Amino acid sequence: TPVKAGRLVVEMGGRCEFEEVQGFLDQVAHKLPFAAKAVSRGTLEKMRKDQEERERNNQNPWTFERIATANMLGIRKVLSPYDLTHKGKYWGKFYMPKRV
Amino acid sequence: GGQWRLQQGLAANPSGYGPLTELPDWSYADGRPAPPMKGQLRRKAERETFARRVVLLSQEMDAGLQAWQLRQQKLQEEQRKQENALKPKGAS
Amino acid sequence: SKAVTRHRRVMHFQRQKLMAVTEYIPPKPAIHPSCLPGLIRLLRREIAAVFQDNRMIAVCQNVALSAEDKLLMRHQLRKHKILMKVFPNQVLKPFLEDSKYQNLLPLFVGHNMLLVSEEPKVKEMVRILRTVPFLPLLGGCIDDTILSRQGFINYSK
Amino acid sequence: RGRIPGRQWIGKHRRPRFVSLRAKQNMIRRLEIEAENHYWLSMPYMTREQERGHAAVRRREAFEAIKAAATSKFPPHRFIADQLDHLNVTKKWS
Amino acid sequence: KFTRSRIPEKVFQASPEDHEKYGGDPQNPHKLHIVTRIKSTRRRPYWEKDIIKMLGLEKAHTPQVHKNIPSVNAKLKVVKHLIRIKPLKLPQGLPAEENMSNTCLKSTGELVVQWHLKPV
RNA sequence: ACCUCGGAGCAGAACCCAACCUCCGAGCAGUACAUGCUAAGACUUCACCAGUCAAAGCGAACCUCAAUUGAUCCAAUAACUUGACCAACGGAACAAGUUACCCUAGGGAUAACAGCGCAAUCCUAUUCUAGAGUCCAUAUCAACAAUAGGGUUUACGACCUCGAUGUUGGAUCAGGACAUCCCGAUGGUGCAGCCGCUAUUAAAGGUUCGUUUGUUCAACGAUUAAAGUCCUACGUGAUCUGAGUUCAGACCGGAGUAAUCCAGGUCGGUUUCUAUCUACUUUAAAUUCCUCCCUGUACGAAAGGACAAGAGAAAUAAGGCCUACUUCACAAAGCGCCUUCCCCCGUAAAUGAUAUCAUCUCAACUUAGAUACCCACACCCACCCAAGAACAGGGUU
RNA sequence: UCUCUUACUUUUAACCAGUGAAAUUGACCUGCCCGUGAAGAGGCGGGCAUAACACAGCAAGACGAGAAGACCCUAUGGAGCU
RNA sequence: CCGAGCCUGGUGAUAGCUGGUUGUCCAAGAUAGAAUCUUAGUUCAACUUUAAAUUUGCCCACAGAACCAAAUCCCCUUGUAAAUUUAACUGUUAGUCCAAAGAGGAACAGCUCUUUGGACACUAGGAAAAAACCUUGUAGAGAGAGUAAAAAAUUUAACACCCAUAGUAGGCCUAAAAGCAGCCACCAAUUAAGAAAGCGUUCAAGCUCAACACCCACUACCUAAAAAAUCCCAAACAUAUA
RNA sequence: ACCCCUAUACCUUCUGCAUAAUGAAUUAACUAGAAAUAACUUUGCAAGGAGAGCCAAAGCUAAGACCCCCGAAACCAGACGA
Ligand SMILES: C[NH+](C)c1cc(NC(=O)CNC(C)(C)C)c(O)c2c1C[C@H]1C[C@H]3[C@H]([NH+](C)C)C(O)=C(C(N)=O)C(=O)[C@@]3(O)C(O)=C1C2=O
Ligand SMILES: [Mg+2]
Ligand SMILES: [Mg+2]
Ligand SMILES: [Mg+2]
Ligand SMILES: [Mg+2]
Ligand SMILES: [Mg+2]
Ligand SMILES: [Mg+2]
Ligand SMILES: [Mg+2]
């Protein structure tokens, strides 16, 4: 089964809190063939708002999306046509959460 | 010091359009000016060609702009000439 | 090599330079904002009960006193009609400060306990104190007068 | 002790290269030059309907000059003078 | 596959902070481009090489005047990564016939019509 | 296995686009009998050949289908017309095997050996904690899975070499790595002791002889402290062998009409080189086993049974010498004799802050923790020598 | 034969004298380690070493010499046999 | 040198195969494919060269190109100067890496196969040496000058103290299963303790946590390896104004 | 003169050779591009041209300028050899 970055692998609910699932869910996610993490609703929304906050308060004048979409320095000769939509956060099957 | 020369406006290469590169190298002892140098003659010819190209492009774009203005005036006058040569009758 | 590999593929050097240029720069604060500048109501009404009621107050140190010894000492003091209160210092000390027993304030520090009554039966409180020798009888007050243990023994005899 | 398998800069296993400060500064300089190019291209003078025919005469006359040269390609003249000056190779004193 | 690049009108819409960063009046635009090639056409596509040849920028660091018209702008938009574009400023106006032999372009992009080689 | 033609994907949107790439088909059928003639303009399978559409006009009337096919010559026929699974489908009119008895021109454009690339396969370490271990994940073993490393196997690629890079094992000499078989040090144990298991550190030193087999391997006999894993062009054939393997002879079984062949067995079968260049040709600290006593002590219910300290006796290795023995004899040798000396780091403790306890400390801090050899130097014609290829060296009183 | 090799004689050898070849040879003022590279470097990169020149010996390297590979493939190249 | 002797002649046999091919200087000049007893070759096309004739050739504005992503086709301006046709032929038609979209293989290969685009098979500088990465191209002399690309950064694990009686060996099941084998419920006293979160017991018994008090205050950086074979490999240096 | 700095012999072959791929000790001599159909250029004459034949809706006649070397195993004929 193909699995892409940012896809929930399994979902859990019930009369419990995060840490209780977080133990064995981290145990399973470490053993997965890709990078994986145990998230909650609040944790997932926290990561998304942190990512948009980092994109907003980035002090670098130059960004991968701006350079790629404007074809600055003729960089699309070494880039991929899918990098225009990945915006430098993806490299093959790998996702880099530290890129903005 | 190319960046500093650019900031002062004195090119970047000190051999570019300075008095140091454009003044005559020598003259006769009694005071007669030397015949002009080959590089300076070539630079003056290139600058004359550059200035003539500037003049040609400027006046060509200006002439095109006034030509477009005149075409717009002709279009508006043919639009505004909308007098009915005959007067309406019948149900009026 | 394919576009997707099991290993992190080596990038073209211009793309690597592009990433190293377009890395994220966090905002830098200027003068470092680190370097820049319940139970209380219930505990209050119960202490109101035991201070405007309950004339005789004795404050002792809450010695460890294993649980069977707690219950038996409590039950002797209860056959002889005084009570053991345990009320915490964090709600008791400011109550003294705004309720005038500030001379009794500097004694409620550390482990503390209250032997409290409406009948002044100091004789067994002190003979239970001699039965258990490691019990100080820190202080307290009789008829709204602050007394030390010498005053308690004088009032007893 | 440390060998890169095969050739250094090609293949599955390459010798790693890392970005230097001066290379980053060079790229930043070129990026600034291009942002300024973006601005000066972002402001135009005329529009397409205004420029529709403003240089047709000059382009036509330049192409007519090119046609005139390409048509005027043709062999050159020959001279009695040149042949009789080749006669001069036996010009002795006396 | 590597193809030509379509460049957004969004990056070619200017902004006010861009105007005061590079001081230039949106109304009354500048009339002529000073274009100067500052990068080789080697290791570049053939269409970019051809457009460099069309614009006349074969020799590097040799400035050239061009019209600030949309067609020339489209060519410079294709080849914008190999060139530097400046506005041609005329402090004392367009050259005339009597001052055409005493011109200089200068590094500031100001075509002066009178050139003395004398101190101010 | 395929060879020609067509449809779909790869090849998403003008055209085109390969793979011994993924699927589906074709070598016709049915209707008509103007399915007659002729003629602008076009398309075109990337050439040509071939193929495709068609206005108008004459004459009548009032084709479906995707591929559904074959050139020239020649043959048949009065003529019109018609002839190949020419399917190797741009088709030679008509021709098979075998060669180790082989030959020639070449090819590292192309295989076998070796190197190189890669790590599917192989090997190791760690993470996770199911499970086993009376209980107990973590003394020990370990599923599913994850992360990383190695380049010893079997492969895969065809990058140097086919105007030669000689080959399997064995002899000889070994260089190196440590992922340690033994000897050294230490931690844990389901470690009472002896024995063990597991982990850390350690590459100075060592790691046997035989029967069968060409064997590497493997089985077995006898030991030993141990009988390590690998790399070195599967180290080493201008140092050797040629038992095996793939030249020419022959036999057996099988295959084939036969020639002949078998990734089957068996008997036999030429191993050249006078060293030009690089490199090198005397760098003195040794390990191990056994015996005694400690001691039948510690330990242990008993059975069993140490570690330190010390003494002796050997063996090997290195260096050397002939007194005797022995080969022998103004001498060279071993089978004989003499000598052989430092540590090594894993960890265990004390004081003591960050963190007024404690804490062995990438806190400051404390403890466990070499000498020898050589060394002078135009007597030299010549002679002798325990010195020596020549040269050199020692003696000549 | 070997454990396990030793001693002696002859030839060879080395030196002196006379005579005097052959294969080989792009030019060489011809070192070591690691890396690189047509993927195994005396000659390239980084480091190390380094007065010059004979004579004897060795065979690890010069992918050493010899023989336009004796195995494999190719050629609309041959030949022998059935 | 007998799988068919030797010599002479046909014979200068033939060779899609190897080797070789001799003065100076300049200029243009790099590989879509189809057939083929063909893939070691050749013919046509394609590219290339020369000489002529003519007029448009590249870049492209809007509108236009089908139902079941990057882009392209077409294309007036515009910037430029090439293009088509005619005549005459040779030679290339055994291809490598890099970026991108894919296919095969192991989402192996300096692997194989297509496409788009670079570079190499031509110069120079850089990444250590260096084909294919980056910078740069049009040629000479100079003991002038401004620049291009262009030098890797990182160093990780301290975590509390004190305290604990009891309705009850809650009920059922079981020999007992007592908070802790499995089930229902989960109340309730002390100031404050779960009909018990881990251990631990055949079951019991025991000891930790959550709870009182106590008090400065939970102090809380949320992170993580190592191996191979001749000999580690520039020397080094934290602090003088881009 | 060396010492300093820079500099990976040549040819052939090939995608690519310092390559450890080929050839070469060195010198002297010898040793390898032959031609038609057409075209192009320059003359002569011109509805004709060429010293019969041939070509001709500007052609005809004349000239110039364009196509290598070595090498097999083989096949056949006639001799000579026990
Ligand atoms: C060395 N021997 C075992 C041999 C081996 C092979 N085969 C190999 O190359 C096999 N080598 C491998 C194992 C594949 C690496 C061989 O192929 C040969 C030979 C021998 C030669 C002998 C030749 C001989 N001459 C040239 C010395 C000769 O005169 C005769 C003769 N009888 O007249 C030959 O037969 C001879 O030419 C020959 O045939 C040999 C080989 O072919
Ligand atoms: Mg390499
Ligand atoms: Mg066609
Ligand atoms: Mg019709
Ligand atoms: Mg065929
Ligand atoms: Mg065919
Ligand atoms: Mg045989
Ligand atoms: Mg041969």
Ligand SMILES: [Mg+2]
């Ligand atoms: Mg191999």
Ligand SMILES: [Mg+2]
């Ligand atoms: Mg278990």
Ligand SMILES: [Mg+2]
């Ligand atoms: Mg290949």
Ligand SMILES: [Mg+2]
């Ligand atoms: Mg070979």
Ligand SMILES: [Mg+2]
């Ligand atoms: Mg050779």
Ligand SMILES: [Mg+2]
């Ligand atoms: Mg170790």
Ligand SMILES: [Mg+2]
């Ligand atoms: Mg070997």
Ligand SMILES: [Mg+2]
């Ligand atoms: Mg050898």
Ligand SMILES: [Mg+2]
């Ligand atoms: Mg043979």
Ligand SMILES: [Mg+2]
């Ligand atoms: Mg025999």
Ligand SMILES: [Mg+2]
């Ligand atoms: Mg030999």
Ligand SMILES: [Mg+2]
């Ligand atoms: Mg040498």
Ligand SMILES: [Mg+2]
């Ligand atoms: Mg002699």
Ligand SMILES: [Mg+2]
């Ligand atoms: Mg090279």
Ligand SMILES: [Mg+2]
């Ligand atoms: Mg090497």
Ligand SMILES: [Mg+2]
């Ligand atoms: Mg060499």
